Amino acid sequence: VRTIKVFTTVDNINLHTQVVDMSMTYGQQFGPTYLDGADVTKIKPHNSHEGKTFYVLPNDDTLRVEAFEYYHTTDPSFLGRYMSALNHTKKWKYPQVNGLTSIKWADNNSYLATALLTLQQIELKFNPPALQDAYYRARAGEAANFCALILAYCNKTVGELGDVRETMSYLFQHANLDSCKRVLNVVCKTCGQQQTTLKGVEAVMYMGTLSYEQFKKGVQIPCTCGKQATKYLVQQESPFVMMSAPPAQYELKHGTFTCASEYTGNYQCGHYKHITSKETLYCIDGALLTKSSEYKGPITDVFYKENSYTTTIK
Ligand SMILES: Cc1ccc(NC(=O)NC(N)=O)cc1C(=O)N[C@H](C)c1cccc2ccccc12
Ligand SMILES: [Cl-]
Ligand SMILES: [Cl-]
Ligand SMILES: [Cl-]
Ligand SMILES: [Zn+2]
Ligand SMILES: [Zn+2]
Ligand SMILES: [Zn+2]
Ligand SMILES: [Zn+2]
Structure with a gap:
C-alpha cells in the first residue's frame, strides 16, 4: 500500500487533505477529479502529484x-x-x-x-x-x-x-x-402615452439602435394597436448602457462612446474586433493593435458611460 497526500477542493479556497492509494484511479477514490482543468478521473496517482490540489x-x-x-x-x-x-x-x-x-x-x-x-x-x-x-x-x-x-x-x-x-x-x-433603473415613455397617436420602469439587466441593454442619443430622442416601435409609436428614455440610473443592433456601417467619434464591438462576415461564423476610445481610437483584434483618429465600419454593440440622466422632454 503506497500512498501520496493530495488536496481536494471544489473552490480552490477550502482544501481537504486526502491520502490516495497509487494502485487505484482518482475516480475510484474521489469520483470525477481534475488537475488544473485536465480530467484525471481514469488516471492513477503519480509521485509528482504529491501535495497538489485537485478539483472534485x-x-x-x-x-x-x-x-x-x-x-x-x-x-x-x-x-x-x-x-x-x-x-x-x-x-x-x-x-x-x-x-x-x-x-x-x-x-x-x-x-x-x-x-x-x-x-x-x-x-x-x-x-x-x-x-x-x-x-x-x-x-x-x-x-x-x-x-x-x-x-x-x-x-x-x-x-x-x-x-x-x-x-x-x-x-x-x-x-x-x-x-x-430605466424609465421609458411610449407615445402613440391612438393609445396615448405610457411609462414603464425596467430594473437590472433590462435597464442597461437595448437592441435596435447603436446611438444612445437617438434612444433619448425617440425610436419608432410597433404599438399593440397596430400603429408605429415613439419610445424614448425618460430616466436612466446605471454606470453604463449597452446599445446593440444587427451589424451595419457606423461612424465612431473619439470621446462620444467608451468602446464598441465590430463584427465582420456572415451571421454566426464572422469575426469580432474591439474599438476603444482613448486619446485616439484603438482597434484591438486579439493580439493585434491598430489606431486611427477616425472609424467607420460594421458595429453591432456600443457601450457608453452613465450615472443619472433625466430627459428635458415634456
Ligand atoms: C456570431 C454569433 C454567434 C451566435 C449568435 N447566436 C445566435 O444567433 N443565437 C441565437 N439566435 O440563439 C449570433 C451571432 C451573430 O452573428 N451575431 C451578430 C452580431 C449578429 C447579430 C444580429 C443579427 C445579425 C445579422 C446578420 C449578421 C450578424 C448578426
Ligand atoms: Cl472546496
Ligand atoms: Cl448569481
Ligand atoms: Cl444565484
Ligand atoms: Zn470543506
Ligand atoms: Zn483548444
Ligand atoms: Zn396604440
Ligand atoms: Zn447568485
Whole structure:
C-alpha cells in the first residue's frame, strides 16, 4: 500500500487533505477529479502529484454548500464544464494591448476577447465570488480562469461560435445591477402615452439602435394597436448602457462612446474586433493593435458611460 497526500477542493479556497492509494484511479477514490482543468478521473496517482490540489465533484453536503457559495449554482455539470474550458483557456496567451488584457486568437475566441476587453472598461460587480475573484485576476493579466468561467456560465464550449451581446446578457444576470433603473415613455397617436420602469439587466441593454442619443430622442416601435409609436428614455440610473443592433456601417467619434464591438462576415461564423476610445481610437483584434483618429465600419454593440440622466422632454 503506497500512498501520496493530495488536496481536494471544489473552490480552490477550502482544501481537504486526502491520502490516495497509487494502485487505484482518482475516480475510484474521489469520483470525477481534475488537475488544473485536465480530467484525471481514469488516471492513477503519480509521485509528482504529491501535495497538489485537485478539483472534485462535490460528494457530500459540505462540498455542495462550498460549491454554491463560490459559484452560485447547484448544477452538477457546472464544474466539469468549467474544467473542460479551463483545459484550453490555460493554454491561450493573454497579451496586454493598450493597457487591457486581451486574448491571442485561438479556438474561435474573438467574441470572448471582445467581451473580456469590454468588461475591463465598464463598472460591474459579479455576485458569485468565483466570477469576481477571476475578474480581478484577469484585469491583472491572468485571465484563463475568468474566460473558462464565462464559457461555463454561458453554457458555451471552447470553439463554439458566440455573440458578444448574448455573452454580456448572461454575465449581467450574474452581476449586481439591482440599483439600475430605466424609465421609458411610449407615445402613440391612438393609445396615448405610457411609462414603464425596467430594473437590472433590462435597464442597461437595448437592441435596435447603436446611438444612445437617438434612444433619448425617440425610436419608432410597433404599438399593440397596430400603429408605429415613439419610445424614448425618460430616466436612466446605471454606470453604463449597452446599445446593440444587427451589424451595419457606423461612424465612431473619439470621446462620444467608451468602446464598441465590430463584427465582420456572415451571421454566426464572422469575426469580432474591439474599438476603444482613448486619446485616439484603438482597434484591438486579439493580439493585434491598430489606431486611427477616425472609424467607420460594421458595429453591432456600443457601450457608453452613465450615472443619472433625466430627459428635458415634456
Ligand atoms: C456570431 C454569433 C454567434 C451566435 C449568435 N447566436 C445566435 O444567433 N443565437 C441565437 N439566435 O440563439 C449570433 C451571432 C451573430 O452573428 N451575431 C451578430 C452580431 C449578429 C447579430 C444580429 C443579427 C445579425 C445579422 C446578420 C449578421 C450578424 C448578426
Ligand atoms: Cl472546496
Ligand atoms: Cl444565484
Ligand atoms: Cl448569481
Ligand atoms: Zn470543506
Ligand atoms: Zn447568485
Ligand atoms: Zn483548444
Ligand atoms: Zn396604440
